[PDB]
């Protein structure tokens, strides 16, 4: 019926404490989604080109050239932390939980409303909105994951984080195949390097369509759609950070002489000369046993080529790295490769009363200390004569290939059988929750964007489209675009995301770091006088844990 509501708005986070210290967390999110009709009812194949930018020698890092199928449909993506948890709930979770499991996910659409804009021809323009009770909203649910997976948080296009603000969906578009060549150059590179877009190789063409691969439900003003509960199987996400590096693994050396009076200069002394110490070292030609040369069980962290660009059929891409930098915690402005930087708009955290289109930005300096500090590690000759000379060492200050600004660490990879690393920490509120595992026979060990990875499947993507509202002059034989009555839709989206977490237990004398309100961040969690809201980034691994 038109006058009977088909659902209830619900945005309450529930905690239900189970046996053995586990907590059943239910995050109900509810939004009002506004949807305009598509620009055109037809699928487009658009080749986006920015050769003007890359035509300038040395700008190869600014390539946006690609090919995309632009579709008339719109994607309703809720794969972002902010959509589910308000700052207080996240504070509770990070301060008192230790591990997080993704349990279930369900979503539904109700109170579908379709309206048409009749723009009067009156000399002073005016427009009246009318309820078209017969219009239909097409809802498609890719339950079988037939369509390409296109997470929205990567582009900051998920639903809004404010329950009391209407949100808009994102027009769905998926990459089409293409070939590209961008020979790197630098300021001073003579001529124009080879920069060509070869087009689409026929063997790799895929042209998906929702109308052909997904059943489509037509919802009038009195209808509702529910996706049913989806159950995850993702690995647990740890809410604790590791501080121990190789230098802090195992039994420390025995201090034969200990300080006698408190002070900043009263250090402990091992006493025994370095060459006469007792231990085990992987270096078989030196008797010097040191805190640096001692044998650790394995390697915590791996050095990777940083700011290295790799070319493939589609052009250049930046090599990802799964660890943060060392010493970047001192200042966010001193961040470097590996620290994820998020840019977001007024829907996703930026002060809602800000003027201008400049996105709000922040670099997330993770609390885990498993990264690398390239200025430190060096290489020296096998003879290990000490002190080393210029001919027997390769310091980070040394050039490679004659380039004064590029040193050896830029092309150094220490990933090996002994490498150990942690999963990506959650980022609030702009961070993604789950991601799909790759279809490759051999699959990546971890993803750099989401902490939870679907082993089998992720929930089907939800697509919404205002059904065509034809005028009486329609003619399919006309090459011109279809004439449509201006129409839009407002519908309420309600989702339930269920987590399971473990409550932390104190295991040390000293307290641990905790998220708290303070005089500096006070006014970042309350509205301004003109209704301005914001959601600042919050750290998710404040509690430490021992690695070995």
């Amino acid at each position, epitope marked *: 019926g038109v006058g009977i509501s088909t659902g209830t708005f619900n945005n309450q986070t529930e905690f239900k404490f189970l046996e053995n210290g586990w907590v059943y967390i239910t995050a109900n999110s509810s939004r009002l989604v506004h949807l305009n009709m598509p620009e055109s009812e037809n699928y487009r194949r658009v080749v986006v080109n920015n*050769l*003007d*930018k890359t035509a*300038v020698n040395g700008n190869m890092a600014l390539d946006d050239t690609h090919a995309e199928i632009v579709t008339p449909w719109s994607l309703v993506d809720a794969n972002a932390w902010g959509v589910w948890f308000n700052p207080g709930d996240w504070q509770l979770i990070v301060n008192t939980m230790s591990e997080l499991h993704l349990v279930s996910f369900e979503q539904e659409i109700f109170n579908v409303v379709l309206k048409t804009v009749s723009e009067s021809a009156t000399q002073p323009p005016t427009k009246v909105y009318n309820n078209d009770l017969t219009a239909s909203l097409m809802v498609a649910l890719d339950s079988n994951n037939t369509m390409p997976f296109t997470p929205a948080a990567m582009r900051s296009e998920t639903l809004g984080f404010y329950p009391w603000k209407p949100t808009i969906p994102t027009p769905w578009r998926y990459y089409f195949q293409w070939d590209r060549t961008l020979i790197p150059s630098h300021t001073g590179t003579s001529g124009t390097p080879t920069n060509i877009y070869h087009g689409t190789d026929p063997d790799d063409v895929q042209f998906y369509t929702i109308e052909n691969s997904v059943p489509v439900h037509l919802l009038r003003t009195g209808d509702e759609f529910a996706t049913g509960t989806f159950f995850f199987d993702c690995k647990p996400c740890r809410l604790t950070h590791t501080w121990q590096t190789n230098r802090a693994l195992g039994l420390p050396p025995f201090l034969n002489s200990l300080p006698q009076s408190e002070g900043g200069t009263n250090f402990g002394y091992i006493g025994v000369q370095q060459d006469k110490r007792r231990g085990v070292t992987q270096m078989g030609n030196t008797n010097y046993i040191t805190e640096a040369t001692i044998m650790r069980p394995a390697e915590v962290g791996y050095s990777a080529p940083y700011y290295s660009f790799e070319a493939s059929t589609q052009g250049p891409f930046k090599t990802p790295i799964a660890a943060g930098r060392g010493g970047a915690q001192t200042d966010e402005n001193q961040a470097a490769d590996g620290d994820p930087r998020y840019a977001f708009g007024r829907q996703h955290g930026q002060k809602t009363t800000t003027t201008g289109e400049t996105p709000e930005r922040f670099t997330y300096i993770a609390h885990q200390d498993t990264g690398r500090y390239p200025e430190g590690d060096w290489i020296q000759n096998i003879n290990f004569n000490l002190p080393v000379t210029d001919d027997n060492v390769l310091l980070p200050t040394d050039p490679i290939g004659g380039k004064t600004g590029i040193n050896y660490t830029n092309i150094f990879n220490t990933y090996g059988p002994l490498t150990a690393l942690n999963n990506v920490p959650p980022v609030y509120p702009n961070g993604q929750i789950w991601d799909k595992e790759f279809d490759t026979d051999l699959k990546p060990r971890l993803h750099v964007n989401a902490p939870f990875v679907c082993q089998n499947n992720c929930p089907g993507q939800l697509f919404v489209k205002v059904a065509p509202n034809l005028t009486n002059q329609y003619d399919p034989d006309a090459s011109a675009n279809m004439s449509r009555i201006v129409t839009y839709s407002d519908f309420w989206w309600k989702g339930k995301l269920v987590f399971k977490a473990k409550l932390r237990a104190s295991h040390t004398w000293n307290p641990i770091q905790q998220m708290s309100i303070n005089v500096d961040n006070q006014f970042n969690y309350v509205p301004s006088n003109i209704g301005g809201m914001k959601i600042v980034y919050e750290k998710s691994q404040l509690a430490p844990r021992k690695l070995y």
Partner: antibody
Framework: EVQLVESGGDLVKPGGSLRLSCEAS????????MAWVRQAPGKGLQWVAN??????TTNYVDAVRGRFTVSRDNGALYLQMNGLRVEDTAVYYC?????????????????????????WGQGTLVTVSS | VLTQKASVSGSLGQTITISCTGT????????VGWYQQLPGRGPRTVVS???SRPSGVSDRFSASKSGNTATLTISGLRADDEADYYC??????????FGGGTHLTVL
């Protein structure tokens, strides 16, 4: 249709300064590299300067190098002229430098390039004398 | 400066050719553009490489490039073709280099 309109041409004294403008409409002005090209009375076309699509780099000819400057504001082009000399008297045009060239008739494949101007403005006359 | 012929002349309906020349190190690797210049008008791009013409340009124009030389062919002269023709390209010294022009004329 693409529209480029120049302005600012006028009589000026030698050794002074001036500002010529090139307003653009009907196309994505920010997606095209732009160029200032001058022609003296009855003489051939002479390249004055050029600027990329983001202002990262600008290039000049030796005759105006160190004297003039070029800038853009996503809506129009500007040429700042300093140390004007008698020979500078000429008509100036703003043209889009074709940054992409397709290599097939339907032009499914395209390549980067330089040295071809696609669209031109109207042009403006600058006279420097007493 | 690229080399060009000062002028040419021909009868109406004749298919004619004009040439622009320069060092292969600059006219070779870079593209070449041909523009028309009528009295009381700014240069109009007639040929933009790959024998492709801008919209609104008569199909009579054609162009080709080989090493030091670039050739522009007109398939049948018309009274409105009496005008200056200008070749331009990029130069590996990071310049934009034009030719001296050629005043096409009709007998």
């Amino acid at each position: 249709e693409v529209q480029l309109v120049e302005s600012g041409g006028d009589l000026v004294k030698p050794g002074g300064s001036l500002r010529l403008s090139c307003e653009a409409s009907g196309f994505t002005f920010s997606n095209y590299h732009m160029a200032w090209v001058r022609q003296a009375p009855g003489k051939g076309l002479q390249w004055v300067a050029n600027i990329d699509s983001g202002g990262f780099t600008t290039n000049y000819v030796d005759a105006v190098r160190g004297r003039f400057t070029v800038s853009r504001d996503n809506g129009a082009l500007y040429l700042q002229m300093n140390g004007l000399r008698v020979e500078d008297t000429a008509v100036y045009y703003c043209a889009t430098m074709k940054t992409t060239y397709c290599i097939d008739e339907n032009c499914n494949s395209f390549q980067a390039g330089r040295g071809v101007f696609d669209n031109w403005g109207q042009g403006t006359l600058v006279t420097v004398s007493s | 400066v690229l080399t060009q012929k000062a002028s040419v002349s021909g009868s109406l309906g004749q298919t004619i050719t004009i040439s622009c020349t320069g060092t292969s190190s600059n006219i070779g690797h870079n593209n070449v553009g041909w523009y028309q210049q009528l009295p009381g008008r700014g240069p109009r791009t007639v040929v933009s490489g790959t024998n492709s013409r801008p919209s609104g340009v008569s199909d009579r124009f054609s162009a080709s490039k080989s090493g030091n030389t670039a050739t522009l062919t007109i398939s049948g002269l018309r009274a409105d073709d009496e005008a200056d023709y200008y070749c331009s390209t990029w130069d590996d010294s990071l310049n934009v280099v034009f030719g001296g022009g050629t005043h096409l004329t009709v007998l």
